[PDB]
Amino acid sequence: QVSTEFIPTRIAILTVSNRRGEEDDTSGHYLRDSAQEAGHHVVDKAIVKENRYAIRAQVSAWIASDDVQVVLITGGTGLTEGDQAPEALLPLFDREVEGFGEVFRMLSFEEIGTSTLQSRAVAGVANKTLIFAMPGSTKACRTAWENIIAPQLDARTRPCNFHPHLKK
Amino acid sequence: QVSTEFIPTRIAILTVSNRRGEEDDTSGHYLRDSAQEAGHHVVDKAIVKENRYAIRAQVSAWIASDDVQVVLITGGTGLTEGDQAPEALLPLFDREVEGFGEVFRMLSFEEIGTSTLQSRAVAGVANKTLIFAMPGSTKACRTAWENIIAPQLDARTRPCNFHPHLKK
């Protein structure tokens, strides 16, 4: 159940934004850098429009692929008309990992207050592919990565983590 | 809106099968051939394993594409554990086109009898992409194309057809 050595996971990163460009993709850059620095391999990275169909095409390709084990998504979880991440992803999940959105909103409430109601972070599993959708804010991503995701992607984490159950 | 002339549609064909290859794919061929012998353009074709995720990845790309207006799928609508076409697609739909399944099972009863209950044909629309999922049997494909889809894809058909609702 628990390994004595760090075991790298294969991660794909996605930025949902109509204007965001590689240059001004701060959350995308943050997740890539944090992942690489922790020892994981980032095998793909893309930026898509806030479009529900563009999100489904990229994420479904990764769900069906042999190598992507984890998908990290930033953006598109807001309450506007164009925020489509949750709508695009929920129907693709085999199962939802409810502890993620709850613990994230809990930590986020202490950090930014009632503004945490403005985001709909959610995680799920499809074809053994782990998918985490977080807000576009870089601080939100740091809160999610350091206190929640990184620990669970680390094979040495007691009492248990995702390692044994990931694709391949 | 009914045109006075014929207007070609950009169609993508998909075969769902674990064994079938391009050579022994009678249904894929029939559809490409029929599609063309009617004046439409077949912009893409592919074969996927009877796998819910493989189907989702390929069909989501076509839905998000600028060129594919119509998708035709043969296979996987059965009642076995491996038949996943309906399961794969239903959640990708913006709207379901009930008329298809009901009509197809109607004309099919008149030809194969109660064996019509062994198929779960269905169609829907997603990002203006028209999606038809029919049985693997070439005879079924014939009944669907000739008696239901072909006419509906003919812009001259009255009282109405899909012409005005296809993605530009």
UniProtKB/Swiss-Prot annotation, chains A, B:
GO biological process, any: Mo-molybdopterin cofactor biosynthetic process
Residues binding GTP: S108
Highest taxon above the source species: Bacteria
Keywords: GTP-binding, Molybdenum cofactor biosynthesis, Nucleotide-binding
CDD domains (alphabetical): MogA_MoaB
GO cellular component: cytosol
Pathway connected to this protein: Cofactor biosynthesis; molybdopterin biosynthesis
Residues passing through the membrane, by range: none
Matching InterPro entries: MoaB (IPR012245), MoaB/Mog-like_dom_sf (IPR036425), MoaB/Mog_dom (IPR001453), MoaB_proteobac (IPR013484), MoCF_biosynth_CS (IPR008284)
GO molecular function: GTP binding
PANTHER family, per database record: MOLYBDENUM COFACTOR BIOSYNTHESIS PROTEIN B
Family as reported in the entry's similarity comment: Belongs to the MoaB/Mog family.
Role played: May be involved in the biosynthesis of molybdopterin. Can bind GTP and has low GTPase activity. Can bind MPT, but has no MPT adenylyl transferase activity.
Protein name per the record: Molybdenum cofactor biosynthesis protein B
Organism: Escherichia coli O157:H7
